[PDB]
Amino acid sequence: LLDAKASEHAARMTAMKNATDNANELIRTLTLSYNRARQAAITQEITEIVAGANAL
Amino acid sequence: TRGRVIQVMGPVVDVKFENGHLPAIYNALKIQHKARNENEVDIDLTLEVALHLGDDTVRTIAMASTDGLIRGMEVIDTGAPISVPVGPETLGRMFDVLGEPIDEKGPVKAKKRWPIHRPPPSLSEQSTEDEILETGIKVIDLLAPIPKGGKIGLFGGAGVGKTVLIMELIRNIAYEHKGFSVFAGVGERSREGNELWLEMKESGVLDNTVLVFGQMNEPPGARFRVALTGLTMAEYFRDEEGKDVLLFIDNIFRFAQAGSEVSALLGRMPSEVGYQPTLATEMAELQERITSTRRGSITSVQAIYVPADDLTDPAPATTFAHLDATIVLSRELAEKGIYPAVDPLQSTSRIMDPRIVSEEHYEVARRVREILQRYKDLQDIIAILGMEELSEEDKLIVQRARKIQRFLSQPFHVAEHFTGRPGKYVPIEDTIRGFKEILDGKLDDVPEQAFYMVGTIEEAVEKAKKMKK
Amino acid sequence: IMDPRIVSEEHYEVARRVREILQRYKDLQDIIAILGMEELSEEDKLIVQRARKIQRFLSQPFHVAEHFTGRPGKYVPIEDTIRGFKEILDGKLDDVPEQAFYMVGTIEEAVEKAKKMKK
Amino acid sequence: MTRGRVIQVMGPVVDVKFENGHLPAIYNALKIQHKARNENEVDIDLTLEVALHLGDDTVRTIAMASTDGLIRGMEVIDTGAPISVPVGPETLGRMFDVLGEPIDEKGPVKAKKRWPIHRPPPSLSEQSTEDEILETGIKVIDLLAPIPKGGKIGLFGGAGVGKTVLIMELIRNIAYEHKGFSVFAGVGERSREGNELWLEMKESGVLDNTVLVFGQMNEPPGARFRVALTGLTMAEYFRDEEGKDVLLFIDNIFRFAQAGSEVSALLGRMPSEVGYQPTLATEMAELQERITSTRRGSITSVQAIYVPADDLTDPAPATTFAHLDATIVLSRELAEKGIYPAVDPLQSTSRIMDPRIVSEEHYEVARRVREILQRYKDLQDIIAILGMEELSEEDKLIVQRARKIQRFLSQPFHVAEHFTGRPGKYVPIEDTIRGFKEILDGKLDDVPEQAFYMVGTIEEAVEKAKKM
Amino acid sequence: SDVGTVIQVGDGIARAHGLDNVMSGELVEFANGVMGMALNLEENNVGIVILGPYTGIKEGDEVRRTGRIMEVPVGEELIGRVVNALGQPIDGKGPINAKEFRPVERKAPGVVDRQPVKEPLQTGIKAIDAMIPIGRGQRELIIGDRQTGKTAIAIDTIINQKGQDVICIYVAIGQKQSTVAQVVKTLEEHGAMEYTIVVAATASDPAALQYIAPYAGCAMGEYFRDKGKHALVVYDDLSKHAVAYRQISLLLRRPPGREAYPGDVFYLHSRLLERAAKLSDEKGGGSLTALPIIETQAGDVSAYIPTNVISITDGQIYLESDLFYSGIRPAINVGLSVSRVGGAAQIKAMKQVAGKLRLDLAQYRELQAFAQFASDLDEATRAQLERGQRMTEILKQPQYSPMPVEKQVVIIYAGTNGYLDDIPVEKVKEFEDGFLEYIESKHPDILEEIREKKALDDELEEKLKKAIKEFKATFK
Amino acid sequence: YFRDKGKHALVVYDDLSKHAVAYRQISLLLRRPPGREAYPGDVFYLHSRLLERAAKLSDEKGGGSLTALPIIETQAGDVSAYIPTNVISITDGQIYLESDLFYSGIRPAINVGLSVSRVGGAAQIKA
Ligand SMILES: Nc1ncnc2c1ncn2[C@@H]1O[C@H](COP(=O)(O)OP(=O)(O)OP(=O)(O)O)[C@@H](O)[C@H]1O
Ligand SMILES: Nc1ncnc2c1ncn2[C@@H]1O[C@H](COP(=O)(O)OP(=O)(O)OP(=O)(O)O)[C@@H](O)[C@H]1O
Ligand SMILES: [Mg+2]
Ligand SMILES: [Mg+2]
C-alpha cells in the first residue's frame, strides 16, 4: 500500500503535468487563430465601408 | 403652386417645386392621380420630405408602394407634417401609419389632429417617483423589478420568447391597471396582430386600448414612422387629459433597420455594420418623448431584436442607455426548455437599490446572482475534469444552482398551446418566500425535475409526492 | 448515389456504419487532446480502437505514386472493399495491430503484413 | 518671388493655388503669416508641408499647427525648400519643435547652418562592411544582448521598471568614454512626461550632452508624423561633419506609424490591412535607412515599440521588426525582486551574438549563463511547492550559482547618485566576460550572495566580502 | 462680403454659397435666428453644422457672418447652476449674469509651464486611493462594461471634495434627461451643489451641441486653474462624443476610416485631455484634473476609441462585469489598473501602509485562480490565501460613503500587519465599523496627528496598543 | 539569356513577400479593388508570370535550363496564408525552415519530415 499510494500520486502528478502542457499549447494555437480572425474581420469591415463610401 | 415627380428610385422619390415655395423638412405631400388612358393606373400616395437639394428639388420617402408612378405627375404640398387624430374617440380602434382606421367600424370623428413630430419635454418639467409594479412573473418580480413610469426593455434573438413575454405582460399589467393602454406592432407579423385584436374583443379590453400596425410587408417609409403615430396618441392622454398610460412596442429594431434601408438611397455615407450615419440621433428622438412629466406618466415595455445573439450590434447597443430596466432572453435556457428564458445575471433595473426594496428582497436577489454566477464558471470545468474531481462546497453549489435555475420557469396563460398547461400567477411575497427556501437548502431532497413550468413552491412538494418521492 | 435504391443493401449498411464510427471518434477528439485516452472506458475506448484501423484502411498505394515511394500501386474491386470494411466493423480483425492497415489494397494483405511484423 | 492663396480648408488639410504656374516641389514648406485687418479677423503664423500636385495649378498640403481662423483667399509663400532646422554644437542642451524653433525660454539659436528634413540615405558605396560592438559599459547589455554600431535596437517593457534611468545612463556612457553626443525624439509624447524627463536631464547634468525634440500629443497628425525626421537630421550632422558616433532615442515608433495612418486617411488614400496606410513599409524605410554606420562615423538607435493587442503580427510591429538588429526586454518581476537594471536575460537577443563576431569565450560565457538561468526558472515552481533541503546536491549547486549569477548581472549606475549612496560603475566588455567566467566554475561559491549584489567588476565583490 | 444663401439642408447640416470671408471654426447666424458653426471651406460652398432645430431652415434662406469664434461664460457665478453646452441656463433659477466670456478652443500648457504632480486628489474609495492613486493635475480614465459602477465612482469622488479648496465640473454627454435629473438631485441632497457646475448635452440635443460640451467644460474648469485654485472635470462618456463627431464628419462627406471614424479622432480627444495640468509657480501654481469615462462592448479594450484614450491618459481604472455579478463592489480589477504617478500622488502615511497592501494583494491574485478548492496545502500558502481573502473584504465599499484618508490608512494598517487573523472572512465588514466606533473617541487625537504630521512611523505604538488591547479584552 | 544559348543558370529572389507588399502599394494608390488581405486579385498572376519563365528546354531548343529559388517569410510560422499558399501552388516543391531548430543550435534548421521535392529522385546521381 505504501508503494501503491506513492506510485498513484506520482502517476497523477505526471498525468496533470501533461494535461496542463496540452492545454497551454492549445491556448497559444487558438490565440494565434483568434488574432488572424481579428485582423481579417477588421480589413473586411473597413473595405466594405470604403467600397460603400466610394459608391456614394 | 404644385410640384412634379422627377426620379422614382424604389422607396425614395424626388420632387421639384418650380415656384421656389419648397416644403419644409418632414412635411407631408399628396399624389392623387386618375388614369388618362387605358395604359395608366390610378394612384393614391403620401410622401414625407427628408432633404432639400439644390435645383428647387426635394427628396421624399413614400409611405406605400411606388409601383405605377410616372415622371411628370402632379404633387400637392399639405403645408404640415403627417397629422394624426387625437382624443377619446380613438379608443377601441385600430390604425394605419397615417392614423386612418384599418378596422371596418367607419370613420373617426375626433375634433383635433396632431403632427407625429413634436419636441420632447424639457428638464424643468420631468418627474421620477419610484415604486414597484407587480407582473406576477417569478423572474421579473424578483431579479429586475419594473419601475412604474419607467421604460422596460426585453432583449433577445429570433424565437427566444419576446412576443410570448409581451403578451403575458399585457394580460397581467393592463388587466390589473385602471387607465388607457396603447400598443404598436412595429414591423411584425400581421397574423399576431389579428390574434391580439380577437383576444381584446373577447375580454372587453379594447374599450380602454388603442392599436397601431403598419407590419412587415409595408415599405421602409411606413415601418419607421409607425412608432411615432402610436406615441402621439399616448402623449394626448398624458399632456391633455392627465391620465397614466401604458405603451407596449414589439420589435423596435425594425424602426432602426427601416431607417438604415432608406439611408443609402437618400445619399448618406454608410457607417459601422451598414447602418445610417444618424442611428443614435434617430433613436433618441423616439425614446426621449416616452417619459413621465408633472402632468402624467407613460410606463413603457419594448421588445428588442438582437440580430445574431450579439448585444454589440449598433441598434441593440444604442438602445441600452435609454432603459430603466433591462431583461435579456438567452437561447441557452430556451434549448433546455426553461421558459421565459430570462438570463438571471444580465437582467437588472433602476429599482434594485437597498433604499427602495424590502431587506429580504434585496438579500435573496443578490444571493441568487452569486450562486448562479459561481455555478456558471464551475459547470465549464466539470465537462473536462468530471464531477468526481470537485470539492463538497462545489457539489452543493451545483445541486442548488440547478434547482434555482429551474424554479425561475413558469407556465404563462398565453402559452397553453406550447406548454400543455393552463397558466399561473405568482405574487411578489410568494416569489421571495419560494426562492429563500431553495437558497437556505430546505428542499435539497426534492428532485431537479420538480421545478419545470411550476408556480408556487408548495406545488413542487405536491409534484414530488405525485412522482412517488 | 448513396440511396438504398441505387447501391446494394450490403454496400449501404457498410458505408453508413463506417461514417457513424468516424463521426463518434470526431466527438471524442476534442477531449482526448487534453486528457489523452487513459480516462476512456468500455465502448468509447473500443470505438477509437476500430476507428484507427478504419481511417488507415482508407489509404491506398497509387500507380502514379511509384515515383515518390518504392511501393507498387493497387486497384481494389468493389466486392473486396465492402468485405474488408465489413470484417473490420464486425471485429473479426481486432487482434491485428493498427500499423498493418497502412497503404494496402485488400484485407488479406493486412493479415500477411501483420504476420511479417510478428507482434 | 512667387505666392499662392488658400482655396480650401477642412481640419488639418489645406489646398493652395499658384496662379502664375510656378509651383512648389512635393516636400516644400509654405508659410502663412497674416495680421488681422478688421476686428472680425484673427492673426495667424502657420506652416504647411506639400503632399500632392492636384492639377489646375493647385496643391494639397498637411498642416503643422491649428487651421482655425484661416480664410479662403489668404496669401501664402513658398520657401523654395523642405522644412529646415538649425544644426551644430549650439543645439546641445536645448528643446525644439518640429520646425526647429526652440521651446525653451533661453533666447534665439544663432546656428551657422540650416539643413532640410528630407535628405537621401547614404549609398552602398558609402557604408562600412564589418560590424563593430558599441561598448555601453553595462554588464547585462554588453554580455547578453550586444549593441551593433549603426544598428537598430528595440525596447519592450512595462511601466515602472527604469527605462528613463537606462536611457540617461546610456546617454552618459557614450559622451564620457566614446566622446559622442545623443538626440532624443519624443514622437507624440504626453507633455507631462516630457516635463519630468527635462527636469531629470537638468538635475543629472546630462542636458549639455543631448538634444531633445518634442512633438506633443495635442499637435495635428502632420506635425506628429515629421518629428522623428527633425531629430534624425540633428544626429546626422554629428556623423557627417564631426565624424563622431551618436545615439538616437525614439520613445515610441508605433506613434510614428499611427501618425502616417491618420495623415493618409485625411489625404483620402485607400486603406490596407487593419486600416493602415498603403505606404507603411516605404515610410518606415525612409526613416530607418538613414540610421547607419558609414565609413566616417555611425548613428545607433534605441527605439521603444507598443504592441497594439499583445499581437506581434500586427502591421506596425511587423514592418519595424524587419529593420531591427537587437531586442531588449524590461520586466516588472526583476524590479519587484530588487535587480537593476531590470533587463530580462532570457528574452533579450541580438544578431551579433554569433561566435563569428564575438570571441569564443564571450559565446561560451553567454550560453552557459542562459543555460543556468533557464534551469533555475524550472526549479522556481518546485521551490514554491517544496523545501530547499529536499532538492538534489546537483540541483542545489545550480540554484545557488543561478542566484549569484542573477545578482552579478546587477550594477550601480552613475545617474542613480541622487537616490542612493552608490557612486556608479562602468564595466568594459573584457572585464565582465572575465568576471562571469570565474563565477561559472564555482571559484567564488564560498562567498555570500550579497557580495555580488549591486557591484561592478569581480575584484570589488572580493573586497566587499573581505569588509563583511 | 459677410452674407450668403443656403443651397442644401438636411440631417442638421447646411451648405451655403457666398460667405467669402468666413474663418475656419467661426459662428454664423441663419434668417430663422438659429446659430451654426462653419467647419468646411470648399472652393464654392461653406459646410455649416447647425446649433439648434434645423426644420425651419429652407434652401434659398440667407445666412450672415457674426465675426466671432465659439465663446462661453466663465466665473464663480456658474457654481450651483445647470447649463447647456453654449452657456445658457437649464435649471430655471434665472439668468447667469456673467462678467467675462472666452474661447472654447484654447491651446494646452507647454512643457516648460508645467510642474511635477505631487499633491493628492482624495477620491475616498479604499481601492483607488491606496492601489491606484490620483494627483492634482493628472488624467485618470474610468473604463468598463455597461452597468458596472462608472458614474458611481465619479459622483462618490465629487462628494468627497466638500472640505478641500476644489471646484468640480460634471459634463453629461449623450445622457437621458431623467438620469441627469437623478444626478443633479443627488448632488443637491449631498450638498455638492455648493462647489459644482453641471454642463449638459442630453441624447435629444443636436450632435453639434454634444460635440462642444467637453471643450466648454474645460473652458469653465481651467478658469479657476489660471487663478491658482484647483479644479476637477468629469466626462461621463467620451465614447458618446466620438459617435457625435462621426455623424457630423460622415454628413460633411469627410473620408471615413476604422469603424467609420474620421482620421482626426485621436486628435479630438488629445486637444481636450492635454489641457489638464499642474502649472509652475510663474503661472501661479494652479491645477486642473480630468476623469474621462469610457464604455466598452463585451470588454473590447482593443477597439479604436478605447485604445486612443488608454494611450493618452496618465493611467486607467478597469471595471469588470464578472467582478460585479460576484459581489465585489466597486468592481475594479486591481490586476489590470495602473497609475503612472503612484508614490508621488499619495501622502507619506498612505505610501508606508499601501506598500504592504501591494505585495499581499499581488500574491493573492495569482494563488486563488488555482489553489481555492484544495483541502490541505503548505501553511505559507494557507496564510497567503487567508490574508488575501481578508484584504479583499477591506477594499469592498458601499455607494455615497467615501472615507477620509486618516480613516483609510488606519484600517489598511490594521489589516496589512495581520491583526485580523482570528476574525472570520464574513466578520471583517463588522470589524471595520466596530474599530472605527472605538476610534470615534480618539478622533480628536488621531485626526490632528494624522492630518497635521502624517507620520504613521511615530504613531505605531498608539495604533498597536489600542487595536490589540480593546479587541482582545472585549472578544475573549 | 544564358538558357536560350544552351548554358545552365540559377536565380534567387530574397523575399517574394516583400515583392507582393510593394505591389499592394501601387494597386491601392491606383484605386484598384482589394481582396483577401487588401491584396489585388492579380497577386497569383504576379508570381505566375515570373516563376513560369524558369524551365528546362528540349534538345530541339538547345537543351539549356533556368532554375529558381524563391524565398518567403511567414508570420508566427503558419504555412496556410494567402501569399505563401499562392507560391506553394506554383513551385515544384518546398524547403521548410523552423525557428525552434535555429534557436536550439540545429543548423541548417530544415524540417526533414515536412519538406519535399516533386521533381526530385530523377535528378540525383546513382551514387
Ligand atoms: N412561456 C413559454 N412556454 C413555452 N414555450 C414558449 C414560451 N415562450 C416561448 N415559447 C416557445 O418559443 C417560441 C418563441 O416564439 P416568440 O413569438 O416568442 O418568438 P420571439 O422571441 O418573439 O421572436 P420574434 O420577436 O421574432 O417574434 C414560441 O412560439 C414557443 O414555441
Ligand atoms: N458599490 C456599489 N455597491 C452597490 N451597488 C453598486 C455599487 N457601485 C455601483 N452599483 C450599482 O451598479 C449600477 C452602476 O450604475 P452606473 O450608472 O454607475 O453604471 P454606468 O456604467 O455608468 O451605467 P451607464 O452606462 O448606464 O451610465 C447601479 O445600479 C448602481 O447602484
Ligand atoms: Mg416576436
Ligand atoms: Mg453612467
Written description of the protein model:
The PDB classes it as electron transport. Keywords: Enerygy, Ancestral ATPase, electron transport. The entry is titled "ATPase Hybrid F1 with the ancestral core domains Catalytic Dwell". The structure is cut from a larger assembly and holds one copy of chain A (56 residues), three copies of chain B and two copies of chain E. Chain A has 56 residues and is mostly helical. Chain A is built from one helix and no strands. Chain A has one helix spanning 2-55. The radius of gyration of chain A is 24 Å and the shape is rod-shaped. With 469 residues, chain B is α/β, with parallel strands linked by helices. Chain B has 13 helices and 18 strands. Chain B has helices spanning 138-143, 162-170, 190-203, 220-239, 253-266, 279-287, 314-319, 331-334, 359-385, 392-407, 416-419, 428-439, 457-466; strands at 3-9, 12-16, 28-33, 43-52, 57-62, 74-77, 83-86, 94-95, 112-115, 132-133, 146-147, 151-156, 180-185, 209-212, 245-250, 298-305, 325-328, 348-349. In chain B, the strands form four sheets. Chain B has an eight-stranded mixed β-sheet, sandwiched between helices. A six-stranded antiparallel beta barrel of chain B has the order 1-2-5-4-3-6. A two-stranded antiparallel sheet of chain B has the order 7-9. In chain B, helix 3 links the parallel strand 13 and strand 14. Chain E is built from 14 helices and 16 strands. In chain E, the strands form three sheets. An eight-stranded mixed β-sheet of chain E has the order 8-12-11-13-14-10-15-16, with helices on both faces. A six-stranded antiparallel beta barrel of chain E has the order 1-2-5-4-3-6. In chain E, strands 7-9 form a two-stranded antiparallel sheet. Chain A binds chain F through residues 32, 40, 43, 47, 51, and chain F through 33-34, 37-38, 76, 78. The complex binds adenosine-5'-triphosphate (2 copies) and magnesium ion (MG) (2 copies). The site of one adenosine-5'-triphosphate has 12 residues of chain E, from helix 2.
